[PDB]
């Protein structure tokens, strides 16, 4: 079932825009925040926009983007945290601890600018 990913940092729902950009919005009515998570392996997931069919991904520099096709840069390691929120780390760059994150202003955070402990990397999955 689809779901929203609420980032406690700024209170934004993760959004994958049509142009391939990724950010966050507080507008629960946005059509680009309905995400479908599917697990390849336990703890590994693809995050897809049901509206545009794009997959969340992170390039070799830690930049989040919307990929029109599923590839290895779209695989994320879903990890439950003490607070019961989820952190999503790039599987491809897991050894760099590059997480999916949103700044308090709703803009995406770059992988290298993120690290555990940050409120920017905590997302609460909400089944629609």
Side-chain half-sphere exposure of 90, counting CA atoms within 13 A: 29
Show contacts of 19-23: CB within 8 Å, 24+ apart. Answer: 19/66, 20/54, 20/65, 20/66, 20/67, 20/68, 21/65, 21/66, 21/108, 22/56, 22/64, 22/65, 22/66, 22/108, 23/102, 23/106, 23/107, 23/108
We report the CATH number of the domain holding residue 101 as 2.80.10.50
Residue 80's domain comprises 1-128
Q: Binding site annotation covers 86?
A: no
How many domains does the chain fold into? 1
Structure token pair of residue 18: 């049509």
């Amino acid at each position: 079932k689809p779901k929203l990913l609420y980032c406690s940092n700024g209170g934004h729902f993760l959004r994958i825009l049509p142009d391939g950009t990724v950010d966050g919005t507080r507008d629960r009515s946005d059509q680009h925040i309905q995400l479908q998570l599917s697990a390849e392996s336990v703890g590994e997931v693809y995050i897809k926009s049901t509206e545009t069919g794009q997959y969340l991904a992170m390039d070799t520099d830690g930049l989040l983007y919307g990929s029109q096709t599923p590839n290895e840069e779209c695989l994320f390691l879903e990890r439950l945290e003490e607070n019961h929120y989820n952190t999503y780390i790039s599987k491809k760059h897991a050894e760099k601890n590059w997480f999916v994150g949103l700044k308090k202003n709703g803009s995406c955070k770059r992988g290298p600018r993120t690290h555990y402990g940050q409120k920017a990397i905590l997302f609460l999955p909400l089944p629609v």
